Amino acid sequence: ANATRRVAIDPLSRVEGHGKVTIWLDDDGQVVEARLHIVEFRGFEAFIVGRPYWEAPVVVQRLCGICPVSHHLAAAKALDRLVGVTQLPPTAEKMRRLMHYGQVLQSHALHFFYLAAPDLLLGFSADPAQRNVFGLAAQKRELARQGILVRQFGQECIEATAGKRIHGTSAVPGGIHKNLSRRERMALLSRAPEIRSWCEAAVALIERLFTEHAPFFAQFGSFQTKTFSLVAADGSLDLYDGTFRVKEANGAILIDHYDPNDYDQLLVEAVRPWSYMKFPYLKAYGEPDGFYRVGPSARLINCDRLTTARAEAARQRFLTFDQGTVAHSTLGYHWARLIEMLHCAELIEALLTDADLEGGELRARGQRQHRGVGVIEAPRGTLIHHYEVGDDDLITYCNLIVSTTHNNAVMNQAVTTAAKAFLSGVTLTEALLNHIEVAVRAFDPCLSCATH
Amino acid sequence: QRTAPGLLAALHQARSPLDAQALAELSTAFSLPPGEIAATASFYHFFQTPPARYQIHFVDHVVDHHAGVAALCNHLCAAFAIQPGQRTADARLFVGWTACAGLSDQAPAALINGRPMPRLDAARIDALIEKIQAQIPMDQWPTEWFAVTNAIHRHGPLLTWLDTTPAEAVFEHPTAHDPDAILQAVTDAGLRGRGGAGFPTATKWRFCRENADPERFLICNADEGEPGTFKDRVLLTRYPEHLFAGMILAARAIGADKAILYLRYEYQYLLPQLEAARERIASAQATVPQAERVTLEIALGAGAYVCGEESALIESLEGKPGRPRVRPPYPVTQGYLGHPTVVNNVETLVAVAAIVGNGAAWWRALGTPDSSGPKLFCVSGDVAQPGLYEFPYGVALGDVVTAARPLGTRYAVQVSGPSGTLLPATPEQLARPLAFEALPCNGTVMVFDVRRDPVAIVHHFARFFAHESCGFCTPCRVGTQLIAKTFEKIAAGYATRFDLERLAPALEAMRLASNCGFGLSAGNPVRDLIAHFRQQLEAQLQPHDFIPAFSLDAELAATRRLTGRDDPHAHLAQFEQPEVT
Amino acid sequence: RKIRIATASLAGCFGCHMSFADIDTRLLALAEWVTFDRSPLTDWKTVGECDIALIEGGVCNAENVEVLRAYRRAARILVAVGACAINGGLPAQRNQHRVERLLTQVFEADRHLAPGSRVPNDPELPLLLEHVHPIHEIVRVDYYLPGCPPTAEVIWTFLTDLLVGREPHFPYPTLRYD
Amino acid sequence: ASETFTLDEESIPFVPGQTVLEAALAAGRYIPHLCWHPEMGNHGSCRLCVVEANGRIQASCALPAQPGLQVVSKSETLTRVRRTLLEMLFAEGNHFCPGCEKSGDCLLQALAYAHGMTASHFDPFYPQRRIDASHPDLWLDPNRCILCGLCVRASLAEGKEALVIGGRGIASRLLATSASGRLGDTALAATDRAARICPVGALNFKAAGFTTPIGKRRFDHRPPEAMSDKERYT
């Protein structure tokens, strides 16, 4: 309100999409308020209407070029339900998993190695010309080569299961339109151990970092907010399929095993005039109590377990760390994220010994209905697709609530926390402004996704 | 295969609201599914007009624009709070546009429920504005308003012969009753098409007669059509009986039981006189045995310039969209209802009456060795006396122009309508003879003095080609549109050098790959603009490397309205600014 | 002197930049041969001046135009990358609808919104254009890389060519629009 | 095959009066074409078949073979003129191949790849025609339709008369012949020859899309020249 001076980081760097933060100061050099403006919008929910249902997995994935697989499968899952199919046949289930596990693997490696680690490894103040993936390639080459190669293996898993590294077509209502061949499966399986061993190294790395920098990273903030994600029935983490679980900061399971199909009785979206990204919250708590957060650290907090050994060992270490604090840390997201990346490698390593990837059980069909909801844990948090379809076969309604959209409040909050931490003691540097962007980057924000 | 002969007539019939009910009646009548009929009907301009008590089309034609028809349209559109191309709440009035209606000499003009109203002034528009509010039937209006003047500003032997000798007289003499003799008379005269094509008339008659099929048709082409042409309109008003003589003579020459005057929609006012005349001439044959005699019919068109192309005319008459056929076979082989068919222009057939009337020597006495005979010329534009001028073929462009008295100093001339050439008025150009061997001319000459912008003129033609394209083939359907859009961009001040560079390959494709001569012609205006008026066009290209073709706001108008902003950041500039080091 | 490359995303999905990164370890070799101005991968907040601008995405809103123009002035060779930038892409399916009717569908009418929800008004947000347009409708384009996204092999071949001076050649087997 | 003519310095046998296009393809010598089809013969709308002869450029689908006719199908001018036509058709409609269920199974697209088309250099027309999903087994996106007229011809020939091209100029579009203007109200059936003959993504079966892996689609790394008539034609 009494804010007198305005300063803007515009546009946000090393994130996907078009975002801008405004930071409102006063005459004392003190910061009243910060604000995350998500500054782009294409309107997929409204222009997809009128199109045939079978287009959706293919067109709607154009929301994003990092996680189109997340939208491809979400749309597929929703249209499975439409076409009357809940359990997939085995071959389709396993192909879809491999696509997704590969998707999470590469997306996490895209973020750490290309977008985030330029700061974390060359330091938050490094001269801009170096503070990027090329400065990293020059300085810490063998590290950057590994990351690139981790991302590659993920994408190459997608090429095999979807038809392209970016924007495939194989996930269809009922299942999948193809299987792996033996050569694709072996080629992949042969690479998989080495990729996983580099993800191991990457976790060792990010721990070593916190061991040394943890007091400093705490300046960027904590959350007392609720955590939202998909657990499986048992209820370990399952990135492909599961029902909703919400824990309170202390956690404290508020809601568990809530049917994704009823997401509309559970959730509501608020709109502020200053962002195209909406503000989702839990209906029955209103705002700002009903806000929550999703992604890497929400999952590792929420789930009972990770189904792969090495990554669960490392999860314990992430939650125990001096001594609980960091799990609810803003920059905690990076340690969580690299753990999921290891987890995915370990999944994949196993999944490619399953001969059902070569199976002939690709597709089921059932009773047609008019509505379908598909949910999946996308790399950056829980994703929801909702479609309604006429007897026309033309979509009559689409609603998407996308992972990054959920963290709108918490990202705003964290932007504010670091703005105070680092700018109230004027005067402004480029390097101190970068400190704000660093806080944003921890969330791996996908702003195209967020807005759609 | 898909012929529906009477359908064109029937579609007019079914207008005195073309509802799904009336389509069902025609579908049974014609054995065509209702939507096929709808589709045919949708091809024609005058069949797509929103119903009203008063339908008014203003003449979108370069000469009418020069006489300020633009303004006078808005003086009426404003007075009913509507836009051109839409109709009033009560369905009382529709005001819209139309291509040249064959009134180029009497500009500015408009069509109103079919009847033409020439020489409009604000006092006519004001007196009209009242007439529609007081809700008066048109017949009650002063019939002064609808009088069309067919001013002949220079007779020669032909118009003289026409004024002198009556129509029926030619049937006294023995040639008129011998098919071979008529063919020969014409062959000896060296007559050539006065529709602009300019193929030996006699030759096509022969090819048509040499065909195995005894059933044959003559069609007379009075979809004159080309902007600026009105010579046919004069011959129809002045000498209808002579036309029908020629129709009969030529029908006899080629052995055709039937002969069909295909009259454009705009000239429907001439119908009662033409029926009178047609019936008077069909008496002068009554002596013939009735099995033997040539039947004469008149068909009314319904708004298309593409229908001045032979095969498209035929398609129209067979109750189908007037889209050019894939030839061969050509119509002289397989035309109307699959029978051999000759399509001749009005002036050509009138010549035929004169040639059987006076002999071939009399004809070949006039004109050049290659282009023999007298030609008529419909001159209009920036001239003291627009109207019809007889000259011998071979006359210098200058003389024709001069005989009408340019109002300003001469600048540019459009020879033979937009399909022909746009030429500057240099002495070297005005020296050029008007004949097929030199500078081909179908008789249309349009004079523009130095107030006129060559560029803006081409743009008027560009739009006409865009509107009148039959839409059948890729380079013409699309390309005509690309041109029209390129000149919209010039007119709005956004055009640069790059815009002509991107347009070239489309012109190439139109000129080479089009399916008919319309798509080939449509590139002609801008070819002439580049070749002669290079500098006048350079003068309307901005010096920028590129500029958006659309108002960049505009584009933000919609979202400004909604959000409620008018700050600078809710506005975009066009253009940019260079700067060199 | 090393060559300078700027990159940008307008109404894009970031997908063309990911296909660029799909050149994989070859990006290490590219790092030696070039230098990056403004690019979502770098921190430079303001463009120019450079030898090559890679633009993904259509133009959808006002800030796309201001940025596209900037990149145009700053760059010698400007390249339209991906289906979006080439002919407007799948986002251009919105040109079937009225832009008001969209925003209102999403931010006001949607059954899952909070009561009182209104289309965003704040001058910090850029206004959407009436239609989505390719980049060539706004500025001059020197080359097009087709695909949604172009293959990494095309993106590589293209750069490889420009670095050596040679004129871009795309073999049939690298060409796609999908 | 009694007679012969010259196609690019080659004696090419012909049955009079085949067209040049017909005779060339019979002899295994491909010439770009779209609206031509073996069962439904010529049409003359696409213009891709154009060739030099007598001594101008004209459609080889309408050009009748004569003994010793001299024909050029491959020149720089011919490749430019075609490229341009391909840019016109793409510009004219909404060929967003990335979400078209005929990508890789579409002749227009394949012809474009084969002429190394990179982008249509024209301002898009962004037409605004309505989808028709009224038929139970079939749907029609008219913003992809190239007015080849194969669907029309196919339907006339088998007696259903379900379709027709109407309008003038750039307004020209495919229409159902039903009184209501809806495909569902015509006699069109999924078993009709017309139902499956569209060579682009305009007229399609319902819920039969994206069934073929990328890499294995009709035209995936096979230009039209490399295909048999079974696979080249719908």
Ligand code: SF4
């Ligand atoms: S060139 Fe083509 S579109 Fe133009 S009128 Fe002739 S056939 Fe029709």
Ligand code: SF4
């Ligand atoms: S072309 Fe495809 S990958 Fe590139 S911006 Fe458009 S949607 Fe993304």
Ligand code: SF4
């Ligand atoms: S129909 Fe063919 S050219 Fe048209 S958009 Fe679809 S795949 Fe592309």
Ligand code: SF4
């Ligand atoms: S629907 Fe297909 S076959 Fe019919 S006109 Fe369109 S492209 Fe031709």
Ligand code: FCO
């Ligand atoms: N991850 C991701 Fe994309 C985002 N945010 C989705 O869903």
Ligand code: FES
């Ligand atoms: S196939 Fe010859 S014109 Fe279309």
Ligand SMILES: [Mg+2]
């Ligand atoms: Mg949403």
Ligand code: NI
């Ligand atoms: Ni994303």
